[PDB]
Design an enzyme around this catalytic site. Structure first.
Site, PDB file in Angstrom:
ATOM      1  N   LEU A  17      50.310  13.067 -16.928  1.00 27.85           N
ATOM      2  CA  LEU A  17      49.046  12.836 -16.840  1.00 27.85           C
ATOM      3  C   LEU A  17      48.259  13.549 -18.224  1.00 27.85           C
ATOM      4  O   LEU A  17      46.880  13.586 -18.270  1.00 27.85           O
ATOM      5  CB  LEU A  17      48.214  13.231 -15.630  1.00 27.85           C
ATOM      6  CG  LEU A  17      48.851  13.049 -14.298  1.00 27.85           C
ATOM      7  CD1 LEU A  17      48.458  14.056 -13.254  1.00 27.85           C
ATOM      8  CD2 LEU A  17      48.980  11.722 -13.915  1.00 27.85           C
ATOM      9  N   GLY A  18      49.000  14.112 -19.016  1.00 29.34           N
ATOM     10  CA  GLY A  18      48.943  14.838 -20.208  1.00 29.34           C
ATOM     11  C   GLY A  18      50.129  15.860 -20.739  1.00 29.34           C
ATOM     12  O   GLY A  18      50.914  15.777 -20.113  1.00 29.34           O
ATOM     13  N   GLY A  20      49.436  18.763 -22.994  1.00 31.96           N
ATOM     14  CA  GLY A  20      49.132  19.866 -23.410  1.00 31.96           C
ATOM     15  C   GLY A  20      49.115  20.961 -22.412  1.00 31.96           C
ATOM     16  O   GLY A  20      49.134  20.955 -21.366  1.00 31.96           O
ATOM     17  N   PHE A  21      51.762  25.876 -21.088  1.00 29.84           N
ATOM     18  CA  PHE A  21      51.782  24.703 -22.019  1.00 29.84           C
ATOM     19  C   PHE A  21      53.157  24.080 -22.112  1.00 29.84           C
ATOM     20  O   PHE A  21      54.105  24.688 -22.388  1.00 29.84           O
ATOM     21  CB  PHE A  21      51.422  25.370 -23.484  1.00 29.84           C
ATOM     22  CG  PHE A  21      51.137  24.205 -24.607  1.00 29.84           C
ATOM     23  CD1 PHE A  21      49.731  23.617 -24.884  1.00 29.84           C
ATOM     24  CD2 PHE A  21      52.222  23.736 -25.582  1.00 29.84           C
ATOM     25  CE1 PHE A  21      49.588  22.683 -25.878  1.00 29.84           C
ATOM     26  CE2 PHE A  21      52.142  22.727 -26.352  1.00 29.84           C
ATOM     27  CZ  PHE A  21      50.758  22.296 -26.524  1.00 29.84           C
ATOM     28  N   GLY A  22      52.965  22.637 -21.882  1.00 31.02           N
ATOM     29  CA  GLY A  22      54.237  21.814 -22.007  1.00 31.02           C
ATOM     30  C   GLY A  22      53.730  20.482 -21.658  1.00 31.02           C
ATOM     31  O   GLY A  22      53.251  19.739 -22.548  1.00 31.02           O
ATOM     32  N   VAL A  24      51.842  18.075 -17.842  1.00 36.33           N
ATOM     33  CA  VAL A  24      51.159  17.767 -16.570  1.00 36.33           C
ATOM     34  C   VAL A  24      52.082  16.453 -16.029  1.00 36.33           C
ATOM     35  O   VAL A  24      51.509  15.327 -16.665  1.00 36.33           O
ATOM     36  CB  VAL A  24      49.833  17.997 -16.622  1.00 36.33           C
ATOM     37  CG1 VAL A  24      49.402  17.809 -15.216  1.00 36.33           C
ATOM     38  CG2 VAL A  24      49.331  19.149 -17.122  1.00 36.33           C
ATOM     39  N   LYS A  43      52.473  21.543 -13.778  1.00 37.29           N
ATOM     40  CA  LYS A  43      52.245  21.921 -15.052  1.00 37.29           C
ATOM     41  C   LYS A  43      53.601  22.855 -15.227  1.00 37.29           C
ATOM     42  O   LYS A  43      53.534  23.671 -15.051  1.00 37.29           O
ATOM     43  CB  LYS A  43      50.875  22.718 -15.295  1.00 37.29           C
ATOM     44  CG  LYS A  43      50.279  23.188 -16.522  1.00 37.29           C
ATOM     45  CD  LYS A  43      49.086  23.136 -16.788  1.00 37.29           C
ATOM     46  CE  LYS A  43      48.497  23.536 -18.065  1.00 37.29           C
ATOM     47  NZ  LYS A  43      47.074  23.413 -18.359  1.00 37.29           N
ATOM     48  N   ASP A 136      33.480  27.232 -20.005  1.00 33.42           N
ATOM     49  CA  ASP A 136      33.544  25.741 -20.286  1.00 33.42           C
ATOM     50  C   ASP A 136      33.201  24.781 -19.259  1.00 33.42           C
ATOM     51  O   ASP A 136      34.144  23.984 -18.809  1.00 33.42           O
ATOM     52  CB  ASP A 136      34.889  25.537 -20.941  1.00 33.42           C
ATOM     53  CG  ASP A 136      34.995  24.193 -21.741  1.00 33.42           C
ATOM     54  OD1 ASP A 136      33.806  23.697 -22.228  1.00 33.42           O
ATOM     55  OD2 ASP A 136      36.157  23.722 -22.069  1.00 33.42           O
ATOM     56  N   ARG A 140      34.183  16.813 -18.225  1.00 31.22           N
ATOM     57  CA  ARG A 140      35.626  16.585 -18.721  1.00 31.22           C
ATOM     58  C   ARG A 140      36.546  17.763 -17.951  1.00 31.22           C
ATOM     59  O   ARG A 140      37.610  17.587 -17.880  1.00 31.22           O
ATOM     60  CB  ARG A 140      35.710  16.908 -20.273  1.00 31.22           C
ATOM     61  CG  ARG A 140      35.353  18.427 -20.626  1.00 31.22           C
ATOM     62  CD  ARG A 140      35.230  18.350 -22.365  1.00 31.22           C
ATOM     63  NE  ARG A 140      34.651  19.546 -22.697  1.00 31.22           N
ATOM     64  CZ  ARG A 140      33.517  19.612 -22.865  1.00 31.22           C
ATOM     65  NH1 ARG A 140      32.364  18.884 -23.038  1.00 31.22           N
ATOM     66  NH2 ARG A 140      32.918  20.911 -23.392  1.00 31.22           N
ATOM     67  N   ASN A 141      35.858  18.839 -17.486  1.00 37.24           N
ATOM     68  CA  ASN A 141      36.722  19.988 -16.533  1.00 37.24           C
ATOM     69  C   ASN A 141      36.311  19.826 -14.957  1.00 37.24           C
ATOM     70  O   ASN A 141      36.567  20.594 -14.415  1.00 37.24           O
ATOM     71  CB  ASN A 141      36.112  21.269 -17.230  1.00 37.24           C
ATOM     72  CG  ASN A 141      37.061  21.701 -18.569  1.00 37.24           C
ATOM     73  OD1 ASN A 141      38.405  21.469 -18.579  1.00 37.24           O
ATOM     74  ND2 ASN A 141      36.389  22.739 -19.342  1.00 37.24           N
ATOM     75  N   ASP A 154      39.671  23.830 -15.496  1.00 38.87           N
ATOM     76  CA  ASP A 154      39.558  24.262 -16.987  1.00 38.87           C
ATOM     77  C   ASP A 154      40.715  23.941 -17.664  1.00 38.87           C
ATOM     78  O   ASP A 154      41.939  24.242 -17.345  1.00 38.87           O
ATOM     79  CB  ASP A 154      39.571  26.070 -16.986  1.00 38.87           C
ATOM     80  CG  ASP A 154      39.395  26.379 -18.582  1.00 38.87           C
ATOM     81  OD1 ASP A 154      38.502  25.904 -19.190  1.00 38.87           O
ATOM     82  OD2 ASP A 154      39.973  27.447 -18.701  1.00 38.87           O
TER      83      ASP A 154
END
Ligand SMILES: Cc1ccc(CNC(=O)Nc2cccc(F)c2)cc1NC(=O)c1cnc2ccccn12
Length: 275
Positions: A17-18, A20, A21-22, A24, A43, A136, A140-141, A154
């Site tokens: 699903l993304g 962006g 750390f490794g 998801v 993640k 933030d 989007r978050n 986040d």
């Protein structure tokens, strides 16, 4: 807190699903629920992993392992024995709120539009109470579950879909300047009142269906130019316009978030009580 060392082999890959750390992944927690088993978001940190980046991931768990609210993302488990270090959260089948609303004008009524912002104020009411500051808050978050259930997460800058939503100010440090209060982009003063100003922009976003970026006519430099005008308070500042399908009362609430003085802004308890 989360289940320390959940068996990895109990997780069945469905789709990433993304990255962006490794990256998801959407996974199926196989074996012994009712009809459908539980689907999770995993993640996992990269193999290479530099000490500081390895430490960053564990700092994320340190922050994430304190949250327990129906409108805050939940850290179910952590795979931390051997590498890759993983952090497991629940899955919001309808992705992010920005992507979700963009597809509607499908249709979501005023009651259900109001219901999403109430849960956001509710989830924000929680963060404040742990003396935590989101920094933030934007659609989007925000992750969408079943029957308009909103959870606050986040994601950082990393999601490349939202690159024109963050402004590089120094080094690798970026800023969501269109959601930030003047004291936030002048003095770097982060408070619940700063999160409240993000909430007013997040509500504006909601009531506009994420079809228009905040401060459309202004540029990344015109937006920071506008912060000074909020501070100077000489009637040379620009506020977000009243959405077409937004009650006079909701825009009045929106305005109170953007009020110059930090103390003059409503609390999330006040916001939630109106919503
Ligand atoms: C698996 C996972 C791990 C770490 C995050 C990032 N979050 C946060 O750090 N939060 C957070 C932190 C502080 C305050 C706060 F308020 C929150 C997120 C996820 N999970 C997903 O990315 C996910 C879940 N459901 C879907 C559906 C579509 C796409 C992604 N996901």
């Amino acid at each position: 807190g989360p289940r320390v060392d959940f068996p990895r082999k109990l997780l069945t890959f469905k789709e990433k699903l993304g990255e962006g750390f490794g990256e998801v992944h959407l996974c199926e927690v196989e074996g012994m629920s009712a009809n459908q088993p539980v689907l999770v978001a995993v993640k996992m940190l990269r193999a290479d992993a530099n000490k500081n980046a390895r430490n960053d991931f564990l700092k994320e768990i340190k922050i994430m392992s304190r949250l327990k609210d129906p409108n805050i993302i939940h850290l179910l488990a952590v795979c931390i024995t051997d590498d890759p270090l993983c952090m497991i959260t629940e899955y919001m089948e309808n992705g992010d709120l920005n992507q979700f609303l963009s597809r509607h004008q499908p249709t979501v009524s005023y009651t259900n539009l109001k219901f999403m912002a109430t849960q956001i104020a509710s989830g924000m009411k929680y963060l404040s109470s742990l003396n935590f500051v989101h920094r933030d808050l934007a659609t989007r978050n925000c992750l969408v579950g079943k029957n308009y259930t909103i959870k606050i997460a986040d994601f950082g800058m990393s999601r490349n879909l939202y690159s024109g939503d963050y402004y590089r100010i120094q080094g690798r440090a970026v800023l969501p300047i269109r959601w930030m209060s003047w004291e936030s982009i002048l003095l770097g003063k982060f408070t619940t009142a700063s999160d409240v100003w993000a909430f007013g922009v997040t509500l504006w976003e909601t009531f506009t269906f994420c079809q228009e970026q905040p401060y459309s006519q202004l540029s990344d430099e015109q937006v920071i130019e506008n912060t000074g005008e909020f501070f100077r308070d000489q009637g040379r500042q620009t506020y977000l316009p009243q959405p077409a399908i937004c009650p006079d009362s909701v825009y009045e609430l929106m305005l109170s978030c953007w009020r110059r003085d930090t103390k003059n802004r409503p609390s999330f308890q006040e916001i939630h009580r109106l919503l």
